[PDB]
Design a binder for this molecule. Structure first.
Ligand SMILES: [Ca+2]
Ligand SMILES: [Cl-]
Length: 110
């Protein structure tokens, strides 16, 4: 047809709505649920979450694996880190942040 129909995609800002506290039930839960309930906007209504990125807030360039940290960065949910999953004897998550790629397909497009 006469239109470029590939999705238009825009990254959100980075969100950091939770901060870890110590103990076996602490962690850092940067889920879309928590982000929205913190007053933050993620995507607009027409757009769909297409990609998630995750990083340590105060160590933004490093692979999280090199910190020995056990985290999940899932497109459906956001980032979850649980203190109980980390190595001891001080079992604790670092502070993470996330950002989202929001994509919207133009009108009348397969
Ligand atoms: Ca956080
Ligand atoms: Cl870094």
């Amino acid at each position: 047809g006469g239109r470029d129909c590939h999705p238009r995609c825009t990254w959100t800002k980075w969100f950091d709505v939770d901060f870890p506290s110590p103990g076996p039930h602490g962690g850092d839960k940067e889920t879309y649920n928590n982000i929205i309930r913190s007053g933050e906007k993620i995507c607009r209504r027409p757009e769909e979450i297409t990609r998630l990125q995750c990083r340590a807030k105060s160590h933004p360039e490093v692979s999280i694996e090199h910190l020995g940290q056990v985290v999940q960065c899932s497109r459906e949910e956001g980032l979850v880190c649980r203190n109980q999953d980390q190595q001891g004897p001080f079992k604790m998550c670092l502070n993470y942040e996330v950002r989202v790629l929001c994509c919207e397909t133009p009108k009348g497009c397969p």
